[PDB]
UniProtKB/Swiss-Prot annotation, chain B:
It comes from the Eukaryota. This is Kelch repeat and BTB domain-containing protein 4. PROSITE patterns: BTB (PS50097). Kelch repeats lie at residues 232-278, 279-321, 324-371, 373-423, 425-474. It comes from Homo sapiens. Component of the BCR(KBTBD4) E3 ubiquitin ligase complex, at least composed of CUL3, KBTBD4 and RBX1. SUPFAM superfamilies: Kelch motif, POZ domain.
Length: 512, 511
């Protein structure tokens, strides 16, 4: 305020209180939401009589705002009937509107997606969309795709597209694929079908349904049939100690969930840290200065890349496709000093730079690359007495605006955990059998601990995610077969899957 | 956080978004306060018929909540009628329950005082009571007193007593005084009525009334305590004849019978001065650390402990809260500026230094309010050697010691003088630019005084006492003295009696 001759405090000024939001907005939280006292309309769903306010409904769902505001000849009654929603689904909806904690079931999940879009709740619809982006299986990604192009939700129509494009071979015989309109089929094929699924045969088998008139589209479909070559899934790099070598094998999952070896490339120098970027290794090791060797599935010959500045051991190498970069967060120097120097290697130009340092230095952490944010889980850190105490810190170093955003909560455990990104979640495996299902968006931990029957020894469990099903691996086994389990997160059922016959499983190693 | 295995993130969930504060709290303010909609209950005040929401009325009030809740034939009709409320006052309550701006005037201020207390409105009964504690003149010092002792408000009953016991002599002739209840008269007498107002005669008025009220003979006499008046204006100024600085003391009276008081004398020069209680603390001389404490009629200049950190042209304020003489800011002779504080006590004589300020300032003015110390105006220099005036206001907390700048600036800057008055902090700059401060409302107020009076630019000093602003003009061209009274209700500058002060210089004026 600068002036006004009329505002004279002794006769006439103008009151201006700054507590009109801390007493009216925050004030109306017990009279409306918690303790419903004054209710206006009675929405009726099936054979029920709900008592819902006319105020809080129009502040969230704009569709309800149009039905209440637009007074007409039918607005004289306070009983409003609904038709689309069921009796046991509207209650879940009215539980979200008032409180904000709706328990999302499994079977009644496609029903809180169709009705949550007509009411235009832009917060539940953006969460039921993420639910359908991670529960998609090989037999379900043909109705979900049809369910995403009708509501115009590109965050699901693309997440449910990389299920019928990487598994088109099995879908060939299915009766749902035969009725697929030409509009959707020109997107599944054009998205880069892998060669192993026979993309050129699905088109031919599909057009034989209505050859009387469907032959016109046959020529156009074969024009856009971009096929991407087959990659190898897990770069299991075996660090044998009996023989000075490193059998960097490349496991290749089959169609029926069977892993087979596809290369026995070897190196003589020691290994400090390893990372895979797309389809190639970028292992780090050797005597000083810290070198880098890059391998490939088909090359079967190690190349050479730009030397590592700031040589150190126990890195936390991560790799992103949303960023042609390979970071080197954390690590401790040769003099047992926990340093923090995030590096910004690029594959296009073999040159190193430096970026914003971490808030807290960690060594031997876990590298998770969920979304475009690099997550550092676990590790070790010395608090006061020069002694490395196993810490539990979740750092969130970014890649767009480089800054550290340490979360205000800690992990259930600590140590030398190994992470493996799966869909939106980030699975974690501790020094034992305590597999957690940490979610970076909801900030919750749902540890689905396996039965302690197979816990004879405190052996670390390596975890790898490939083809939409994580394969929790096993270290050196007591004179037997490696426990290459195939844990199914949906059912928490662990199944022993063999097919790998290697001699490096007798000793510890690194993974990718 | 955490969970257990009944929360399988593939088929189970507990989705809980911590964002029901911008979609249910912000989405309701614009649907109820700003854009009034979905009205259900109609309030039928006399003459008119308003429409109000059931959720906003019961969220700020309590009488309005315990009345809609009880449906004992009080909410089913929905044509409910309110009584003992005028048409105009209720419209200003809708303006307050809703968006939150009120236009409190003087015509309707007692009706909104009682009505806002009947409806249990909490925040409105903290500025409508501050208003009454701000405009109690002698003529209505008793209609407000009895109003205060009906709703149990100590912020007004203890503020309508300091302004109703000093003017006890004039209230004696008033008819309302003779009808005083026995309880009210007891408290106003036993608070230190000045000896010049004849406290003994006040009881004699009831004695000479002519029964039932005449039985009080020994009562109300043992509880009377008389103290001489000692709060007045201290004036500092050197005569043109000699360098002997004078400290003439004058006191204001309601009868305008100014009597010549003792003329205090002093030898050295003055750097700064403070007014605490009924004594004057003078700093200055050849060495700035000299503390020559003076008084009314003791002619004593006892030298106290010197200041450990010597400063020149600093600010002295008295916050009785801790019987302290806090010396905030200052100037250092070693090509730098001081930021320390030294509060010389009376029975302790301590030199403690607390936390410094946030923005450097020197040669400013200070005014104390309810313990909180405000530093306003002054000058600040920079490494660029630029004489940039400072328009930043500083607050010195009395409880948390959290000095911080305010998100605004004064309308002007330079060398100013400040003197509190009721709940306001008046500001006078170089010219006719009166500005009234208000820490609670965080707002200002000017008067737009024309410059036709200040022909020559000269410093103006302001002193406030007995609820009447006094403004003193400095450096007149050998003419009549200027003791303009600045009654802030309406601009009523009148020259008072021409006392022969004969001081053509004004160093400091303290009230």
């Amino acid at each position: 305020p600068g002036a006004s001759m009329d505002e004279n405090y002794f006769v006439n000024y103008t009151f201006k209180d700054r507590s009109h939001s801390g007493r009216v907005a925050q004030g109306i939280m017990k009279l409306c939401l918690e303790e419903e006292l004054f209710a206006d309309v009675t929405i009726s769903v099936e054979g029920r009589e709900f008592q819902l306010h006319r105020l809080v409904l129009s502040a969230q769902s704009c569709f309800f705002r149009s039905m209440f505001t637009s007074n007409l000849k039918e607005a004289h009654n306070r009983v409003i009937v609904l038709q689309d929603v069921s009796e046991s689904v509207f209650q879940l909806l009215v539980d979200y509107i008032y409180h904000g904690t709706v328990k999302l079931r499994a079977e009644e999940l496609q029903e809180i997606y169709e009705v949550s879009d007509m009411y235009q709740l832009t917060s539940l619809f953006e969460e039921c969309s993420r639910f359908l982006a991670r529960t998609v299986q090989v037999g379900n990604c043909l109705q979900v795709m049809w369910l995403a192009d009708r509501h115009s939700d590109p965050e699901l129509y693309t997440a449910a597209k990389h299920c019928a494009k990487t598994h088109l071979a099995q879908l060939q015989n299915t009766e749902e694929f035969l009725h697929l309109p030409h509009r959707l089929l020109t997107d599944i094929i054009s998205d880069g079908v892998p060669c192993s699924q026979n993309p050129t045969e699905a088109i031919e088998a599909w057009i034989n349904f209505n050859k009387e008139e469907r032959e016109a589209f046959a020529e156009s479909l074969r024009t856009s049939l971009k096929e991407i070559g087959e990659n190898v899934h897990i770069y299991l790099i075996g660090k044998e100690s009996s023989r000075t070598h490193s059998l960097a094998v490349s496991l290749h999952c089959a169609e029926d969930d069977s892993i087979s070896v596809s290369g026995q490339n070897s190196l003589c120098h020691q290994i400090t840290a390893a990372c895979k970027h797309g389809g190639d290794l970028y292992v780090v090791g050797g005597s000083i200065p810290r070198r880098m060797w890059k391998c490939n599935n088909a090359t079967v010959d190690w190349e050479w890349c730009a030397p590592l500045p700031r040589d150190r051991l126990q890195h936390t190498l991560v790799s992103v496709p949303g960023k042609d970069a390979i970071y080197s967060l954390g690590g401790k120097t040769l003099q047992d000093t926990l340093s923090n120097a995030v590096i910004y290697y690029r594959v296009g130009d073999n040159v190193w730079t430096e970026t914003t340092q971490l808030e807290v230095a960690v060594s031997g952490a876990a590298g998770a690359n969920l979304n475009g944010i690099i997550y550092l889980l676990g590790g070790e850190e010395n608090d006061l007495d020069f002694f490395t105490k196993p810490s539990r810190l979740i750092q969130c170093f970014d890649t767009e605006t480089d800054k550290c955003h340490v979360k205000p909560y800690v992990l259930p455990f600590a140590g030398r955990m190994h992470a493996a990104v799966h869909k939106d979640l980030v699975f974690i495996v501790a020094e034992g059998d305590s597999l957690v299902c940490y979610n970076p968006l909801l900030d919750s931990f749902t540890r689905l601990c396996l039965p302690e029957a197979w816990s004879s020894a405190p052996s670390l469990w390596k975890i790898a995610s490939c083809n939409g099903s994580i394969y929790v691996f096993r270290d050196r086994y007591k004179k037997g077969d490696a426990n290459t389990y195939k844990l199914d997160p949906a059912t928490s059922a662990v199944t022993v899957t063999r097919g790998i016959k290697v001699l490096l499983t007798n000793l510890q190693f690194v993974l990718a």
